[PDB]
Design an enzyme around this catalytic site. Sequence first.
Site, PDB file in Angstrom:
ATOM      1  N   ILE A  84      41.190  74.813 -78.687  1.00 18.96           N
ATOM      2  CA  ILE A  84      40.997  73.537 -78.013  1.00 18.96           C
ATOM      3  C   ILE A  84      39.769  72.813 -78.557  1.00 18.96           C
ATOM      4  O   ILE A  84      39.822  71.603 -78.777  1.00 18.96           O
ATOM      5  CB  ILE A  84      40.924  73.723 -76.474  1.00 18.96           C
ATOM      6  CG1 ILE A  84      42.294  74.184 -75.944  1.00 18.96           C
ATOM      7  CG2 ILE A  84      40.493  72.445 -75.768  1.00 18.96           C
ATOM      8  CD1 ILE A  84      42.273  74.726 -74.537  1.00 18.96           C
ATOM      9  N   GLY A 107      40.509  71.080 -81.740  1.00 20.39           N
ATOM     10  CA  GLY A 107      41.261  69.860 -81.414  1.00 20.39           C
ATOM     11  C   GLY A 107      40.405  68.724 -80.891  1.00 20.39           C
ATOM     12  O   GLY A 107      40.541  67.580 -81.331  1.00 20.39           O
ATOM     13  N   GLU A 108      39.519  69.046 -79.952  1.00 20.26           N
ATOM     14  CA  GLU A 108      38.635  68.050 -79.368  1.00 20.26           C
ATOM     15  C   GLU A 108      37.681  67.487 -80.430  1.00 20.26           C
ATOM     16  O   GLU A 108      37.380  66.299 -80.439  1.00 20.26           O
ATOM     17  CB  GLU A 108      37.864  68.634 -78.196  1.00 20.26           C
ATOM     18  N   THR A 109      37.230  68.343 -81.335  1.00 19.62           N
ATOM     19  CA  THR A 109      36.442  67.893 -82.464  1.00 19.62           C
ATOM     20  C   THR A 109      37.211  66.917 -83.332  1.00 19.62           C
ATOM     21  O   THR A 109      36.664  65.893 -83.751  1.00 19.62           O
ATOM     22  CB  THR A 109      36.004  69.070 -83.330  1.00 19.62           C
ATOM     23  OG1 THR A 109      35.271  70.008 -82.519  1.00 19.62           O
ATOM     24  CG2 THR A 109      35.151  68.593 -84.511  1.00 19.62           C
ATOM     25  N   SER A 160      37.633  63.533 -81.440  1.00 13.44           N
ATOM     26  CA  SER A 160      36.299  62.942 -81.349  1.00 13.44           C
ATOM     27  C   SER A 160      35.945  62.260 -82.681  1.00 13.44           C
ATOM     28  O   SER A 160      35.583  61.097 -82.705  1.00 13.44           O
ATOM     29  CB  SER A 160      35.278  64.026 -80.959  1.00 13.44           C
ATOM     30  OG  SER A 160      33.963  63.672 -81.296  1.00 13.44           O
TER      31      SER A 160
END
Lengths: 120, 120, 120, 121
Positions: free
Chosen positions: D41, D44-46, D49
């Site tokens: 996760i 993914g968030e990186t 962003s």
Amino acid sequence: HLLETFEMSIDHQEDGLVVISMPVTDKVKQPFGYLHGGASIALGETACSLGSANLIDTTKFIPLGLEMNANHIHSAKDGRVTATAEIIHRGKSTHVWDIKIKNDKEQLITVMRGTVAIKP
Amino acid sequence: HLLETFEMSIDHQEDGLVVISMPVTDKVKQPFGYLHGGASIALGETACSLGSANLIDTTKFIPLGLEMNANHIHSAKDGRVTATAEIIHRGKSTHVWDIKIKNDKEQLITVMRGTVAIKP
Amino acid sequence: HLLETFEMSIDHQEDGLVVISMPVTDKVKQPFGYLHGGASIALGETACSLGSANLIDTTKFIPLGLEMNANHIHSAKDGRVTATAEIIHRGKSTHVWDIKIKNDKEQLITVMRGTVAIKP
Amino acid sequence: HLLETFEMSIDHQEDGLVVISMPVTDKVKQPFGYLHGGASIALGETACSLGSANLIDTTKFIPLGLEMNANHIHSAKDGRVTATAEIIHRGKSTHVWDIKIKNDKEQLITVMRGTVAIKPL
């Protein structure tokens, strides 16, 4: 009967793809009023539920909505909305579906991911 | 008007808390058929949307469902279901709500988190 | 071992409840930089995974993260963050957990719901 | 700097598309142990962003993860995992991203949807 209530029509079914549309009427609107976010989600959940049913032996198993999530992107005020549900993962005990819901103008109304449990 | 369609009743409102109930009828069932997961989610979305409206200036701002997610836990076959929506975060441009939906037997049917955008 | 990487400390654990904290260091920050939302989520997932492992016979079953969702509410720039995971549903094949992650100042950083599959 | 910890490599960027990969090492595993779902996760968030950052004026605005959700599908034990983030909606105050994370064998490890707030700095 929820399908009846919302006047949903199944436009297309094939293995791993379901297309279901419905009219944007006052009975599915919110007070402002646009299409209720929930009604859009209910259309999506219906689409992937029927898709999962189409992929299993329904005399032995049942597809139950387990998790649903959704982003509301644009509003719908009238005409029809259409949910396209495409399977992402067909597992033994879970299916995961990607659902896009669009309006007449081809705008993304609601984008959604649904996890359906396959239960004995 | 979706509220009228589902026969919803607002049982209680206060700042940051909304309780809405509705009967589990065939018109909100899945075919199998239990309460449709979508209908349950629509009940929840109704509750937090009304909650957010109650917390803002209805003439300058509008509450729009932005993101909704939900876990379906137990089935509902009859009687009434009740959604209890409690605010988690009351921000300037977003409200986040925890919503729990239970059946007559006090079983958790659906647990839900909703993010409502506050728009000019 | 992601536990070591993030310097996590298990502050308490009993049936259906796990508390895990960790320091907000540069190694878990975004560039800007606040605490990375992903690191916060990873703390949450760690808490409920551990909780589920504590609730089952680990010589026969394994807990696998199935679905996670999270709302980021406030930023963390320093000190420690603490995840409290409380079980919502302890099923035979799935557990559902509610997780709250707070900073030093008792502010909600991240609120989260996690579904863990219980597999042979 | 969470990028360094996880040894992430940006394989490709263009408007509305980010690809980031990283090695599956013990430091990002669960005990059992496969790739930790959280680390997946976090990759993914990186990705989303960074995507959002690339689409906005970073001298006035900052992208903050607002909501993330993810389905874990298959496990990863070794090699590399790769997150492909494609934008679904580029709004003025929010971006919505689809992210797919695959292993070496082209298997879906994690599929993910992310909502990023665009905030004044």
